[PDB]
């Protein structure tokens, strides 16, 4: 039984949340913000990601070089990432270097220069990033997947933004973005590892007390997405591996079906020919795929947002003449979540998940990421006892009912990249979303 997550607020409405571990000697402190690319419009799309670059380009006190030196002298590192709904800025350090790291984070968030010279310099760096994501096939597939599933909607936009915006982003719009979005009621200061909660609250009172509050404070993790059944094909005969994602509209963080969708996802599970144990997994799809050499890997996913989600599978295969079989067998395993699953699969998946949700948190950065994610999506850290109860409440009837309303005979978003000549047209893929025998 893990130590209790302590939570305090400041007057502005900044949440401080901590989980101490007296067995480690490092600490991860950082700021989780309930804001990301989705908060941009079409004209300033790319701003949030642009700011992330400039946050490390110098503040009103420390220059770019001084910033570098200060962190080098601390001994640990700083890291940041911007997603569609969430931005994170954290610092991993030694136990007693925590006050330094909180001070640096407070500086780069509140007091960043955003100097025209630096805007202009990064504008090329970010332009080069547009032509090099092209290599990260999983990311290419998932970005096209969001773009098509949420066609012409904010969740459909990329994080980098269009080339056009990169050339026209000004310090004015950068400043406007972080003034509107980086408000105290949207921010959580998180500490995990060798942190004292009371010490962290004091550091918050010292550095984050002059943060603006938003005019209308909504609760943390407050949001209408209209999913489009659709396909993007990026055929490239020169690539040896096909990458395919298939998804349906999934569940939000606060859906009542959140755990049901996780259990369903665990019934299909993951597979990777490179891992020794994968040929012995219990999942039916795993057995079909491994026996017939249909794929190098597959990974089931259930991505959530504040008001929607995507539930589906990502496949990679070199078997270019049997892509049809791979997709066919995958979707017939999904059909069985509607028609055939019983207590046998459901209780097996529950067993696997009860551990999986706890195992994931195996270092201070993972713990901080868990506290930060849960605080910015649900408004609270959910105790493992509550999570164990919600998983236990999932029955086979719940899984069947969920799959019959979410998967069965529903539109999919489909992205294929690589040698995908063998991937059939939309109708034949979508026809596998039901079974004529049932």
């Amino acid at each position: 039984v893990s130590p209790k997550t302590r939570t305090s607020n400041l007057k502005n409405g900044l949440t401080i949340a901590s989980e101490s571990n007296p067995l480690v000697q490092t600490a991860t402190v950082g700021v989780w913000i309930d804001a990301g690319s989705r908060n941009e419009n079409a004209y300033n799309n790319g701003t949030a990601h642009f700011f992330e670059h400039l946050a490390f380009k110098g503040t009103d006190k420390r220059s770019q070089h001084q910033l570098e030196l200060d962190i080098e002298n601390m001994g640990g590192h700083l890291n940041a990432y911007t997603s569609r709904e969430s931005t994170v800025y954290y610092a991993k350090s030694f136990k007693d270097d925590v006050p330094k790291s909180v001070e640096i984070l407070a500086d780069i968030l509140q007091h960043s220069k955003l100097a025209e010279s630096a805007i202009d310099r990064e504008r090329e760096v970010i332009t080069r990033e547009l032509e090099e994501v092209n290599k990260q096939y999983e990311e290419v597939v998932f970005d096209h997947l969001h773009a098509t599933a949420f066609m012409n909607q904010p969740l459909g936009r990329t994080i980098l933004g269009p080339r056009e915006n990169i050339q026209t982003i000004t310090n004015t719009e950068l400043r406007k973005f972080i003034t509107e979005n980086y408000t105290a009621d949207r921010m959580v200061l998180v500490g995990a590892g060798a942190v004292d909660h009371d010490a962290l609250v004091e550091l918050a009172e010292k550095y984050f007390s002059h943060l603006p509050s938003s005019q209308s404070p909504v609760p943390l993790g407050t949001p209408i997405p209209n999913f489009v059944g659709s396909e993007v094909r990026l055929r490239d005969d020169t690539m040896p591996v096909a990458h395919i994602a298939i998804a349906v509209e999934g569940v939000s963080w606060t859906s009542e079906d959140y755990y049901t969708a996780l259990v369903a996802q665990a019934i299909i599970g993951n597979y990777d020919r490179a891992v020794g144990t994968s040929r012995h997994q219990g999942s039916r799809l795993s057995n079909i795929v491994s026996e017939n050499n249909l794929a190098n890997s597959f990974q089931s996913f259930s991505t959530s947002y504040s008001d929607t989600g995507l539930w589906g599978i990502y496949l990679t295969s070199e078997n270019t003449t049997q892509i049809d079989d791979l997709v066919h067998f995958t979707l017939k395993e999904w059909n069985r979540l509607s028609t055939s699953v019983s207590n046998l699969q459901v209780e097996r998946a529950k067993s696997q998940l009860k551990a999986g949700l706890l195992l994931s948190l195996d270092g201070t950065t993972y713990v901080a990421e868990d506290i930060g994610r849960q605080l910015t999506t649900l408004g609270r850290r959910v105790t493992p006892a509550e999570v164990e109860a919600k998983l236990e409440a999932v029955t086979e009837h719940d899984v069947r009912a969920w799959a019959q309303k979410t998967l069965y005979d529903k539109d999919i978003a489909l992205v294929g990249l690589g040698p995908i000549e063998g991937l059939y047209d939309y109708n034949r893929i979508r026809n596998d979303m039901s079974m004529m025998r049932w």
Partner: protein
Amino acid sequence: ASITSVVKTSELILKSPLLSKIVVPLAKTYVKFSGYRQLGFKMNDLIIEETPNMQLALRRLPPTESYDRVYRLIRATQFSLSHKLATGNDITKPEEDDHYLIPYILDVEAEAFEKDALDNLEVV
């Protein structure tokens, strides 16, 4: 029938003193009248091989055993088409009639049957 079945039932009989006393002599005569040794076959050469399990067991034979099996099958086919029987050293002597394939097929089937069982497990 599975090789596993055949081997288990045979072991029940070989255990029982009474049963073995009456079955083993019959089985030996049966084998003599069967006449597969007169075409230079070993018993295991006759087992049906057009099955996933048997194809896997044959792929696991050591190369030497596999080359020798191919020759016995070719040689027996030549006796069959010529309507001749083996003579001399081509006749399989009882001491040469070794169960070279049985351990491989028993391992393949053990896994196949465990997989079937475990596909039907119920968390208690």
